[PDB]
Amino acid sequence: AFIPYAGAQFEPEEMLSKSAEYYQFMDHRRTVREFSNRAIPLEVIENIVMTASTAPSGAHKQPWTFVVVSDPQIKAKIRQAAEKEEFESYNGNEWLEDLQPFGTDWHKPFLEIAPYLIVVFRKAYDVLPDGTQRKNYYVQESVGIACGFLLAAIHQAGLVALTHTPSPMNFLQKILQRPENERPFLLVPVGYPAEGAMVPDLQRKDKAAVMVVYH
Amino acid sequence: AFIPYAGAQFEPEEMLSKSAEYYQFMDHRRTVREFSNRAIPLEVIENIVMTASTAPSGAHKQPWTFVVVSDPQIKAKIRQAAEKEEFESYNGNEWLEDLQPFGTDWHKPFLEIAPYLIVVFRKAYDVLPDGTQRKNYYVQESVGIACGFLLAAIHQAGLVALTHTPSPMNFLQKILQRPENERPFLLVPVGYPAEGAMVPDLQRKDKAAVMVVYH
Ligand SMILES: Cc1cc2nc3c(=O)[nH]c(=O)nc-3n(C[C@H](O)[C@H](O)[C@H](O)COP(=O)(O)O)c2cc1C
Numbered sequence: 001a002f003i004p005y006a007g008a009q010f011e012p013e014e015m016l017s018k019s020a021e022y023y024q025f026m027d028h029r030r031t032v033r034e035f036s037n038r039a040i041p042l043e044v045i046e047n048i049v050m051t052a053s054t055a056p057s058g059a060h061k062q063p064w065t066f067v068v069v070s071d072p073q074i075k076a077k078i079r080q081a082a083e084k085e086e087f088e089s090y091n092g093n094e095w096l097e098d099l100q101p102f103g104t105d106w107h108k109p110f111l112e113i114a115p116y117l118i119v120v121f122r123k124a125y126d127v128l129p130d131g132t133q134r135k136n137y138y139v140q141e142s143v144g145i146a147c148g149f150l151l152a153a154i155h156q157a158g159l160v161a162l163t164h165t166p167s168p169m170n171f172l173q174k175i176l177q178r179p180e181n182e183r184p185f186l187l188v189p190v191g192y193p194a195e196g197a198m199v200p201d202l203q204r205k206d207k208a209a210v211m212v213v214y215h
Numbered sequence: 216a217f218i219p220y221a222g223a224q225f226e227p228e229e230m231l232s233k234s235a236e237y238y239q240f241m242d243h244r245r246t247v248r249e250f251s252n253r254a255i256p257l258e259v260i261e262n263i264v265m266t267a268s269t270a271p272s273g274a275h276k277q278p279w280t281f282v283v284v285s286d287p288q289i290k291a292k293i294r295q296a297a298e299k300e301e302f303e304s305y306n307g308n309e310w311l312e313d314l315q316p317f318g319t320d321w322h323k324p325f326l327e328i329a330p331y332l333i334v335v336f337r338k339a340y341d342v343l344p345d346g347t348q349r350k351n352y353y354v355q356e357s358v359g360i361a362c363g364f365l366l367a368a369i370h371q372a373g374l375v376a377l378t379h380t381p382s383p384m385n386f387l388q389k390i391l392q393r394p395e396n397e398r399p400f401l402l403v404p405v406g407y408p409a410e411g412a413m414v415p416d417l418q419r420k421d422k423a424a425v426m427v428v429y430h
Pocket residue numbers: 029030031032033102104162163164165199202269270271272273274275353356357360
């Protein structure tokens with residue numbers, strides 16, 4: 001069965017102004033690594049997560065699981081395991097030169113200070129109630145896109161985030177007790193920014209370095 | 216060097232209402248496969264693309280190239296190559312059962328009818344002017360997220376899109392003449408929806424199937 005499309009449509013002038021304003025708005029977004037521990041209603045995070053879940057996906061499999069962690073003990077254990085992996089990584093060269101402008105150590109207090117950690121898992125396949133497996137398609141792409149929606153929703157809500165690698169992969173899977181068809185994809189602490197929060201003075205690429213037009 | 220974070224912040228009640236409204240808004244987004252060929256100013260697409268490019272990325276490499284195609288001859292050649300690949304795929308089983316509710320053939324008139332095709336490329340590495348290579352990190356994740364921003368921006372602008380696999384991979388790379396460090400990631404036709412546009416009557420997963428909360 002099919003149904004008519006019910007999306008809002010605008011005339012060219014509204015479209016120009018809307019697209020210009022959204023660009024300016026999203027250009028203000030920056031990765032923030034120093035959080036306030038100020039509380040946020042679960043309902044806001046739920047809205048944000050289900051917004052991420054409206055993303056398109058290969059064959060409409062929605063091959064993702066969002067684990068929302070506010071439990072300070074689990075956050076503590078996650079931070080501990082994460083800080084341990086990085087300690088080994090930060091001493092054992094191309095990489096280290098690329099990382100210089102961000103001023104990051106193996107320290108990760110944001111993993112406990114942020115009121116919520118959103119841990120994104122990808123699903124390689126679904127397990128029917130039969131025990132049988134049914135594979136999903138273009139999972140990497142689908143979950144990446146959903147993560148894009150997640151971050152867009154976080155910004156829309158006036159919050160900040162830090163997109164973080166899912167290390168330690170094994171530990172995240174264990175402590176959050178996710179099944180075999182799932183693997184950690186991203187780790188995203190969410191919260192208000194610290195009052196005096198600073199970010200690296202970075203510049204994004206210009207149109208010419210990012211965009212190629214075939215008229 | 217560092218600079219203060221300059222993002223908009225709201226009080227809990229605005230945050231709740233903003234997050235609820237954005238969820239409803241994004242829930243109206245649907246993949247559309249029947250387009251209007253109504254023209255759109257390049258400036259809107261530029262705004263949309265540079266909005267995608269504000270996404271976070273591993274080590275701030277922004278490992279992506281956005282190829283915007285409006286040239287009807289290139290679109291014609293792309294559609295031809297794409298339709299040929301799919302013809303072979305649609306006859307040569309798990310997949311075909313999963314694809315039934317979308318009612319798609321190997322036909323792809325949208326690849327010419329859509330006023331713009333946005334072809335997203337990922338960059339495995341950068342090539343310095345020395346000829347030397349400098350690898351990028353978590354490219355799949357970064358470009359996926361940027362694609363999420365792209366689609367969020369398209370919806371914000373009142374347009375629709377079809378997230379499409381980058382097939383034929385080799386052909387897209389050839390006709391768009393992209394260098395060796397680049398590979399096709401996604402194909403995204405963009406435009407107004409056809410007046411009587413229909414979409415599959417799908418239902419997205421509920422909170423419980425998508426979300427796990429550790430209180
Ligand atoms: C896939 C991915 C992984 C990332 N991993 C880390 C990380 O492990 N540690 C960190 O401090 N930042 C991480 N980041 C944040 C980037 O460093 C940041 O997005 C980049 O420096 C650009 O800053 P901006 O997002 O404010 O534009 C990651 C970003 C992405 C997209």
